């Protein structure tokens, strides 16, 4: 075939919060050939991830103006110049926001799917690059014992909803926070945490956390920052671990919020350790063969926001920095 | 037999900086009796220390601070670390001539109870007794504990040490030079920086005071960035270090002395940097590691006696000066460790 390839470019660099008018749709024409240099695969992009690191990549290796925005996503091989991928099987990894991409598959960037007995939308999230951040970030970096109390921020979403599920499986008391009432209702209905609150309904964030924890916070999984780290630093305990995954409060800000209560690290004998998921990708098969017995069984679940089409995909990345995503924000580019 | 026992009392709680005025003086009568309490010894305090925790045992009851603190009671005297000779006992491990270092009150004579990770015996006299406040005591143990067990160091790695000519800081940077390491310091005066470059053998050093852009100072000093940080300061300083740090690089949070004296506690912005740099900010109290005080003393006393560790001290005479001495530590007119002699020998 010689099909028309619909692409989402970034026009120019973003300074603050993203708008849909920082990105434009352009078209190329892909010849469905055995591809551009005999080391490569040609894929058809099935599902795409709208995940929040993309804002830090939108700043002045960083993205280049007039070219597609790179992201993770699930893809079907249409043709190959690589040895261990034939035509008709599945990968996940860094693809361009296209309908059809030619990529070179390097090991801990791009991964083959062997288990299609679960949704292939989950391989942008749960069994993808959000879910590995929750395995890796809770079991190494947070270093947990049972009974110990876990706090998850942006609990609602991607990374956050597996951290909490893995904790009320270990024997921990887990509290989450989220933006709207419907996002906060899932934490107790579906994912079945012990408590939850709406941080947007809290005028009282330090007092909110003193309410939820009569016994304090041993573990924190930091996805948010600033004002929430200040509050958590007060409500902590003796040898209290903080796992700094993200800072979504800060990405979208030029002159970014200051943390005041870092003196409660000497006193309260705290470890704040920052990680990157990429480092733990050697433990992906170890993760898959732990969590697929549990997803297949209904111990571990997932909520996804579905955004059908490449058309509503500027719409969908913009939407994270406000939290329109009721769970993990997937784009469907192709259904079959 | 009676003693005329002078004391240093605290008036009421501190907000902001201490002054010589937030402290007061009394005299008591102490009987030199063979004391019935339980496992209690009547000591005679010889030397005392001016240590900066004493500020967040001087402020109002807060739950955070109350992990190392108990908070000082507004009437009855200031507690702290210092050396002490036993002038009659009610213990097994201690008798009528033995010396102790530990947490005594700021008086001439005290009835204390020895506890294992509080009060420690001296069964080594070859070295100064004033040193069991600092080097052979609690500042030197912090330096051993927090550099070898929290900064998790390997040879050749680049170390930045803050409040570097004070008690804990000067030892860190020698313990670091005693491995492969590249040690740069920071201190207040010119007299202080000329002890880092010469006496305590640091590779380079500066005056944070005489530096306008602090990142520019640390990008001059380390071209290839910081691997280990011994954090004795906070604020401005911790922000500069986070942009000057290497990947999988560690930070040991000993103290944060810039903050203690502030009501409105200063913000560290770029703690964002620890994701993309895989960095570890780790806090400790020394209290947790006093089980390795035997394994400390078996190490350092071979290195002082051979001339591989160097140390300065700032002695002031009598309890009279012990207000003036704890105050001027927050400004920094202590050169090394601030000792207060109550009685010598
Ligand atoms: N270090 C790593 O290894 C690694 C890897 C991948 C991703 N990440 C990062 O970690 C986070 C992970 O995904 P996720 O689980 O958070 O999924 P998500 O729910 O899809 O992400 C968006 C969430 O951020 C919250 N939010 C947005 N603006 C905010 C603001 N201004 N202040 C406070 N909260 C705000 C919203 O939740 P509420 O209002 O609902 O609470 C919203 O649901 C991101 O920051 C991401 O960049 C880190
Ligand atoms: N268990 C523990 O973790 C533990 C135990 C002992 C001590 N500590 C802590 O570690 C720190 C110092 O240890 P040390 O034994 O070396 O004490 P020290 O001998 O009292 O050192 C005093 C230093 O304070 C500095 N200073 C004062 N105000 C300052 C300010 N506003 N900004 C920056 N620096 C300032 C001075 O330097 P300048 O001349 O440069 O101004 C001076 O050299 C304290 O924060 C203390 O509480 C912690
Ligand atoms: C090339 C895409 C970058 C992938 C690393 C990402 O997981 C890091 C998230 C940090 O916030
Ligand atoms: C009971 C006295 C407290 C002793 C702990 C002290 O070394 C901590 C210093 C923190 O800045």
Q: Is residue A180 a contact partner of residue A248, using CB atoms and an 8 Å limit?
A: no
d(C-alpha B46, C-alpha B42), whole Å? 13
* CB of B139 shorter than 6 A to ligand 2: yes
Sheet holding B99-105, edge to edge: B109-112, B41-45, B79-89, B99-105, B120-122
Q: How many CA atoms lie within 13 A of A223 on its CB side?
A: 27
Sign of the alpha-carbon dihedral angle for A205, A52, A24, A100: negative
* Out of B269, B276, B278, closest to residue A258 by CB: B269
Residues ≥6 apart with Cβ < 8 Å to B56: A267, B65, B68, B69, B260
Chain-chain contact of A263 with B259 (C-beta, under 8 angstroms): yes
Resolution in units of Å: 2.8
Beta partners for residue A175, in sequence order: A151, A195
Residue of B145, B168, B268, B288 best suited for mutating to test ligand 2, as the one with most atoms within 8 Å of CB:
B168
Residue of A51, A53, A278 best suited for mutating to test ligand 3, as the one with most atoms within 8 Å of CB:
A53
* CB of B137 shorter than 6 A to ligand 2: no
Residues ≥6 apart with Cβ < 8 Å to B219: B244
C-alpha separations of B336 from B229, B235, B251 in Å: 20, 23, 23
Angle at B278 between CA B275 and CA B283, to 5 degrees: 100
Beta partners for residue A15, in sequence order: none
The CATH architecture that domain A1-125+303-336 belongs to is Alpha-Beta Complex (3.90)
Q: What is the DSSP string of A192-255?
A: --SEEEETTS-S-HHHHHHHH-TT-EEEEEESS-THHHHHHHHHEEEEEEEEE---TTTTT-SS
Query: Cα B179 vs. chain centroid, distance in angstroms?
Result: 23
* CB of A323 shorter than 6 A to ligand 1: yes
Compute the CA torsion angle B3, B8, B9, B11 (nearest 10 deg).
140
A52 is annotated as contributing to ligand binding: yes
The closest-lying atom of ligand 1 relative to the alpha carbon of residue A328 is 20
Domain ranges of chain A: 1-125+303-336, 126-302
Q: Is residue B81 a contact partner of residue B46, using CB atoms and an 8 Å limit?
A: no
d(C-alpha A35, C-alpha A80), whole Å? 7
Q: How many Cβ atoms are within 10 Å of B228's Cβ, its own excluded?
A: 26
Residues ≥6 apart with Cβ < 8 Å to B330: B17, B18, B52, B55, B257, B260, B261
DSSP symbol at A277? G
Q: Is residue B118 a contact partner of residue B68, using CB atoms and an 8 Å limit?
A: no
Topology of B1-134+312-345 in CATH?
Quinone Oxidoreductase; Chain A, domain 1 (3.90.180)
B150 at the A interface (CB within 8 A)?
Answer: no
Q: Report the 3 state secondary structure along chain B.
A: CEEEEEEEEECCCECCCCCCCCEEEEEEEEECCCCCCCCCEEEEECEEEECHHHHCCCECCCCCCCCCCCCCCCCCCCEEEEEEEEEEECCCCCCCCCEEEEEEECECEEEECCCCCCCEEECCCCCCHHHCCCCCCHHHHHHHHHHHCCCCCCCCCEEEECCCCCCCHHHHHHHCCCCCCEEEEEECCHHHHHHHCCCCCCCEEEECCCCCCCHHHHHHHCCCCEEEEEECCCCHHHHHHHHHEEEEEEEEECCCCCCCCCCCCCCECCCCHHHHCCCEEEECCHHHHCCCCHHHHHHHHHHHCCCCCCCCEEEEECHHHHHHHHHCCCCCCCCCEEEEECCCC
Residues 242-271 of A with CB under 8 A from B: 244-247, 250, 256-271
Sheet holding B337-341, edge to edge: B47-50, B337-341, B313-317
Protein residue with its CA nearest to atom 30 in ligand 1: A249
Beta partners for residue A241, in sequence order: A219, A271
Contacts of B269 in chain A (CB under 8 A): 256-259
Among candidates B186, B203, B235, B202, which has minimal Cα distance to B310?
A: B202
Chain-chain contact of A268 with B256 (C-beta, under 8 angstroms): no
Phi, psi angle pair for B137, to nearest 5°: -135, -140
d(C-alpha B312, C-alpha B336), whole Å? 5
Contacts of B268 in chain A (CB under 8 A): 258-260, 262
C-alpha separations of B110 from B44, B45, B99 in Å: 6, 7, 13
Helix H or strand E encompassing A153: strand A149-153
Terminal-to-terminal C-alpha distance of chain B: 22
- Determine the distance separating the centroid of ligand 3 and the alpha carbon of A227, expressed in angstroms: 23
Chain-chain contact of B253 with A264 (C-beta, under 8 angstroms): no
Contacts of A266 in chain B (CB under 8 A): 68, 253-256, 283-285
Interhelix angle for A129-139 vs A284-295, to 10°? 100
* Residue A257 Cα, gap to closest chain B Cα (Å): 6
* CB of B275 shorter than 6 A to ligand 3: yes
d(C-alpha B10, C-alpha B24), whole Å? 6
What experimental approach yielded this model?
Answer: X-ray
d(C-alpha B326, C-alpha B56), whole Å? 13
d(C-alpha A94, C-alpha A107), whole Å? 11
B92 at the A interface (CB within 8 A)?
Answer: no
- Determine the distance separating the centroid of ligand 3 and the alpha carbon of A53, expressed in angstroms: 6
Phi, psi angle pair for B159, to nearest 5°: -110, 135
Residues ≥6 apart with Cβ < 8 Å to A215: A149, A237
Q: Is residue A237 a contact partner of residue A264, using CB atoms and an 8 Å limit?
A: no
In whole angstroms, how large is the CA radius of gyration of chain A?
20
Q: Which residue of B has its CA nearest to A273?
A: B280
Contacts of B146 in chain A (CB under 8 A): none
* Out of B269, B272, B283, closest to residue A266 by CB: B283
Q: Which residue of B has its CA nearest to A266?
A: B283
- Determine the distance separating the centroid of ligand 1 and the alpha carbon of A264, expressed in angstroms: 25
Q: What is the DSSP string of A26-73?
A: EEEEEE--S-SSTT-EEEEEEEEE--TTHHHHT------TTSB-EEEE
Q: What is the dotted CATH code of the domain comprising B135-311?
A: 3.40.50.720
Q: What's the CATH number of domain A126-302, 3.90.180.10, 2.160.10.10, 3.40.50.720, 3.40.109.10?
A: 3.40.50.720
């Amino acid at each position: 075939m010689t099909a028309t390839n619909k692409q989402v470019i970034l026009k120019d660099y973003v300074s603050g919060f993203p708008t849909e008018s920082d990105f434009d749709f352009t078209t190329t024409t892909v010849e469905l050939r055995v591809p551009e240099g005999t080391n490569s695969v040609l894929v058809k992009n099935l599902y795409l991830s709208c995940d929040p690191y993309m804002r830090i990549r939108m700043g002045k290796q960083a993205y280049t103006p007039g070219q597609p925005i790179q992201g993770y996503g699930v893809s079907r091989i249409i043709e190959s110049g690589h040895p261990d991928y034939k035509k008709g099987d599945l990968l996940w990894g860094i693809v361009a926001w296209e309908e059809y991409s030619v990529i070179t598959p390097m090991t801990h960037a791009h991964f083959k799917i062997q288990h299609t007995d679960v949704p292939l939308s989950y391989y942008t999230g749960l069994l993808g690059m959000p879910g590995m951040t929750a395995y890796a970030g809770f079991y190494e970096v947070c270093s947990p014992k049972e009974g110990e109390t876990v706090y998850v921020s942006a609990a609602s979403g991607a990374v956050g909803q597996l951290v909490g599920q893995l904790a009320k499986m270990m024997g921990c008391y887990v509290v989450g926070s989220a933006g709207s009432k419907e996002k906060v209702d899932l934490l107790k209905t579906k994912f079945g945490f012990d408590d939850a609150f709406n941080y947007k309904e809290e005028s009282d964030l330090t007092a909110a956390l003193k309410r939820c924890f009569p016994n304090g916070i041993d573990i924190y999984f930091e996805n948010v920052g600033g004002k929430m780290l200040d509050a958590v630093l007060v409500n902590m305990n003796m040898h209290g671990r903080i796992a700094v995954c993200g800072m979504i409060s800060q990405y979208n800000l030029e002159n970014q919020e200051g943390v005041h209560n870092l003196s409660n690290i000497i006193y309260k004998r705290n470890r704040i350790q920052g990680f990157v998921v990429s480092d733990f990708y050697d433990k992906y098969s170890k993760f898959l063969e732990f969590v697929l017995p549990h997803i297949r069984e209904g111990k571990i679940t997932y909520v996804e926001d579905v955004a059908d089409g490449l058309e509503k995909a500027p719409e969908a990345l913009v939407g994270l920095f406000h939290g329109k995503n009721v769970g993990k924000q997937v784009v469907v580019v192709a259904r079959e």
